[PDB]
Amino acid sequence: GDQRFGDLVFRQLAPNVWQHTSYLDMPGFGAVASNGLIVRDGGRVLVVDTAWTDDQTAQILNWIKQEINLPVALAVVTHAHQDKMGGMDALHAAGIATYANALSNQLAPQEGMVAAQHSLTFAANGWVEPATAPNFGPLKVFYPGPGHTSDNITVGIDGTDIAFGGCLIKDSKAKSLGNLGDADTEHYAASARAFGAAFPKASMIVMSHSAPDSRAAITHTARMADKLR
Amino acid sequence: XXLXPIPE
Ligand SMILES: [Zn+2]
Ligand SMILES: [Zn+2]
Ligand SMILES: [Zn+2]
């Protein structure tokens, strides 16, 4: 199912949805995969998250050009870390409109990230204010509350079985929540569960650092987080 | 370095 294109991998998850994967070789630690989404919505493409770098993100745009050959209307990035926002200059250079959580844009400079052009805001229930996310088509953006970071956001694809937890969700076989450095350990469990409740029909859970999984990834992540609080 | 899961 995987298609390789330079140093990147693309996996088709639905007729109009692909997972993009980029790698960062870290000496000793080895290659670290980060996943995002590419969505074909009629006559345009929507991207969720950049690659680790500008160069890798340019290759995502080249692949879309080659395999889909539609313009990229917009990209949404799911928090102010390198794996999700490392490639913002490459999207900008391409004249792609970028959206992030207002708080992601606010944290970006301290994190060494370039801010998105536009800020998303959320209701108290976690759902994006539609006026901040115009023409998002099937992208349903949900802020589940603090977990991996204070700014972490999530994306469901309307009319598919796919919801994207980004770095908030770990796979159902994960031994731990990984590094708990920039994390809200108190609210993590509830944030995991809010993601679950926001996209109840999603049977395929896509995440940053594991292969697509079942809803068991949400319940496992929440149950690991329970043992922190 | 803030390389996602890798804290350096
Ligand atoms: Zn940080
Ligand atoms: Zn990450
Ligand atoms: Zn992160």
Distance CA A155, CA A199 (A): 9
Tokens at residue A99, please?
């959206």
A182 annotated ligand binder? no
Tokens at residue A187, please?
């609210």
Strand partners, A141: A155
Q: Which helix (H) or strand (E) segment is A40 a member of? A: strand A30-41
Q: How was this structure determined?
A: X-ray
CB contact under 8 A, A209 and B5: yes
How far does residue A108's CA lie from ligand 1's centre (Å)?
Answer: 10
Distance CA A44, CA A24 (A): 29
Tallying the residues shown for chain A, one arrives at 229
CB contact under 8 A, B2 and A81: yes
The count of C-alpha atoms lying within 13 angstroms of the C-alpha of A32, restricted to the half-sphere facing its C-beta, is 19
How far does residue A44's CA lie from ligand 2's centre (Å)?
Answer: 27
Distance CA A54, CA A29 (A): 22
How far does residue A64's CA lie from ligand 2's centre (Å)?
Answer: 23
Residue with tokens 């000793």: A28
Residues around ligand 2, an ion, CB closer than 5 A: A 83, 167, 208; B 4
What is the experimental resolution, given in Å to one decimal place?
2.2
- Three-class secondary structure of residue A23 per DSSP: strand
Tokens at residue A4, please?
């390789």
A34 burial (CB, 10 Å; 0-12 / 13-18 / 19+) is buried
Backbone torsions φ then ψ of A194, nearest 5 degrees: -60, -40
Q: Which domains, from first to last, does chain A contain?
A: 3-227 (3.60.15.10)
For the CA atoms of A74, A79, A80, A86, the dihedral, rounded to the nearest 10 degrees, stands at: -50
A55 annotated ligand binder? no
Distance CA A176, CA A215 (A): 17
Distance CA A93, CA A75 (A): 13
Distance CA A97, CA A218 (A): 30
Distance, in angstroms, between A155 CA and closest chain B CA?
A: 19
A167 annotated ligand binder? yes
Give the Å distances, CA to CA, from A14 to A163, A209, A221: 12, 20, 25
Task: Give me the sign of the Cα torsion angle A184, A36, A43, A55.
Answer: positive
- Three-class secondary structure of residue A214 per DSSP: coil
